[PDB]
């Protein structure tokens, strides 16, 4: 629905270019300069682009802005990791008299072109605290991280047998070295946490599964 | 340098209104032309309006006209936004942006951003989370490190921030985003990576905020009362 038109999402490996399009009309791009914002992850936008083509200091050679009609485009050359953010164009419309945005592009970044080699997840398994106990609740944490790519599947065992009931797991996000984390919790009672010889967490990457194991009285 | 802070996270019922605020500094205040961007999770920017500082004019977007209102005091150089008859598809991160420098509102564009106060609109009832300590492993090896945490336990609505000792430990920290729980509610957990030798000769604590409950902990994680080596 916004004014501006881009892609919803481009990807490239490291050291490519890649083009973000945004399309817009005779009464924005067609007669007024554009503007373009990189908002990595987490943080505000900050100003890439203005004018079309002119960048702020800081901003390296490698970002580069064009229009031509009543389009604009952004290249990136020399794609690195840290560029992955949401690029949004930008430009004043006279038709409605102020800025207009368009809808944003998501910019991933992915492994090496030559094949980025796979990464096991590492699993930190923690029981519940004395103090969570005291409060008559229990929850197993499960982190899980530096995995590639990024996905996985968790399970739960008590003993040996799968339990579904009480697990919630996030989806995988991505950490400052490029490779990916997820978490997962599994609550209880602090009875059940009594019930059984231990809990798992059993982590599967790409075929091969790491598990982690815990149980109410050990000293770990 | 051009500073820009915004008041904290905030939650609010549907039908009620919300007034953030946005100090400036670094610059001659009433120079500028100061926007604001809002923008819900997922999803773009969308431009609120304008106001100039000087003789406080503003311009609004005309779908928020006549509910939104822009006021600035320039002696605490600080602008505000209030939006009123919230609802829940005004639930969003509201930006304050400094112009980059235009002496007309046409032509005028955010270039200078603050960091964004998020605004939640929801029916659903307000919670501060629960935080416990993540105790660090028992077991001692030369070179050995141990990961101990806090965890924050069911909160609503979204942020919450963490940080160690005060700010003072960053190294070896990863806090991971929260699960959104079947229930409704949030949790999340910070963990730290450290010596394992040095465990119970060092003092690590979790600062946890969650700004829309007003709730502020502070938890000493320390080794299990197990641990007969630290």
């Known amino acids: 629905q916004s004014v501006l038109t881009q892609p919803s999402s481009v990807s490239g490996t490291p050291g490519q270019r890649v083009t973000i399009s945004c399309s817009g009309s005779?009464?924005?791009?067609?007669?007024?300069?554009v503007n373009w914002y990189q908002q990595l992850p987490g943080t505000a936008p900050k100003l890439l682009i203005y004018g079309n083509n002119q960048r702020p200091s800081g901003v390296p050679d490698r970002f580069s802005g064009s229009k031509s009609g009543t389009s604009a485009s952004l290249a990136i050359s020399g794609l690195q990791s840290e560029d992955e953010a949401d690029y949004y164009c930008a430009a004043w419309d006279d038709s409605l008299n102020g800025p207009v945005f368009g809808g944003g592009t998501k910019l991933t970044v992915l492994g090496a072109a030559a094949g980025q080699p796979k990464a096991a997840p590492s699993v930190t398994l923690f029981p519940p605290s004395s103090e969570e106990l005291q409060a008559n609740k229990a929850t197993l944490v499960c982190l899980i991280s530096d995995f590639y790519p990024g996905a996985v599947t968790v399970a739960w065992k008590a003993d040996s047998s799968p339990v579904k009931a009480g697990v919630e797991t996030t989806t995988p996000s991505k950490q400052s070295n490029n490779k990916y984390a997820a978490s997962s919790y599994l609550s209880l009672t602090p009875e059940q946490w009594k019930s059984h010889r231990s809990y798992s967490c059993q982590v599967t990457h790409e075929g091969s599964t790491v598990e982690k194991t815990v149980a109410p009285t050990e000293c770990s | 340098q051009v500073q820009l802070v915004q008041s904290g996270a905030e939650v609010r019922k549907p039908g009620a209104s919300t007034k953030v605020s946005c100090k400036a500094s670094?610059?001659?205040?009433?120079?500028?032309?100061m926007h604001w961007v809002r923008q819900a999770p997922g999803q773009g920017l969308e431009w609120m309006g304008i106001?100039?500082?000087?003789?406080?004019?503003?311009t609004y977007a005309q779908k928020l006209q006549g509910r939104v209102t822009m006021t600035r005091d320039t002696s605490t150089s600080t602008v505000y936004m209030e939006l009123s008859s919230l609802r829940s598809e005004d639930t969003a991160v509201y930006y304050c942006a400094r112009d980059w420098g235009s002496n007309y509102v046409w032509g005028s564009y955010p270039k200078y951003w603050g960091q964004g106060t998020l605004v939640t609109v929801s029916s659903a009832s307000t919670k501060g989370p629960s935080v416990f300590p993540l105790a660090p492993s028992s077991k001692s090896t030369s070179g050995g490190t141990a990961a101990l945490g806090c965890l924050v336990k069911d909160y609503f609505p979204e942020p919450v921030t963490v940080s160690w000792n005060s700010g003072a430990l960053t190294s070896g920290v990863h806090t991971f985003p929260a699960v959104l729980q079947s229930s409704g509610l949030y949790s999340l957990s910070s963990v730290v990576t450290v010596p394992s030798s040095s465990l119970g000769t060092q003092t690590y604590i979790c600062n946890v905020n969650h700004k829309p409950s007003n709730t502020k902990v502070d938890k000493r994680v320390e080794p299990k009362s197990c641990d007969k080596t630290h």
């Open positions: 005779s009464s924005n791009i067609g007669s007024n300069t």
């Open positions: 106001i100039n500082p000087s003789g406080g004019s503003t």
């Open positions: 670094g610059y001659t205040f009433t120079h500028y032309y």
